[PDB]
């Protein structure tokens, strides 16, 4: 399991040695917005048995969960 560290444009030392399950990473923003909220994603944790609404992240068990910025997502 891996998780692009920051990504944005270039790239860094990906792969999450610890917590073999999900690589966290979500965002912030106010509400649904879908435009502003210029923030970032966490980055691996261990698991996400939780299921809360507003927080910052849940879990990212993949190899490309890191989405795009807020301003210009695409």
């Amino acid at each position: 399991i891996v998780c692009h560290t920051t990504a944005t444009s270039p790239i860094s030392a990906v792969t999450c040695p610890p917590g073999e399950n999900l690589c966290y990473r979500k965002m912030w923003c106010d509400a649904f917005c879908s435009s502003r909220g210029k923030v970032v994603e966490l980055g691996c944790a261990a698991t996400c048995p939780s299921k809360k609404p507003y927080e910052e992240v849940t879990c990212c068990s993949t190899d490309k969960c890191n989405p795009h910025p807020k301003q210009r997502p695409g």
Binding site: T6, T8, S9, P10, S12, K38, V40, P69
Partner: peptide, 18 residues
């Protein structure tokens, strides 16, 4: 005590696109 620090962080425009 002046700082004007940024609340949250930012994704785009990191610093390596240098």
């Amino acid at each position: 005590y002046r700082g004007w620090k940024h609340w949250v962080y930012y994704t785009c425009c990191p610093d390596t696109p240098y």
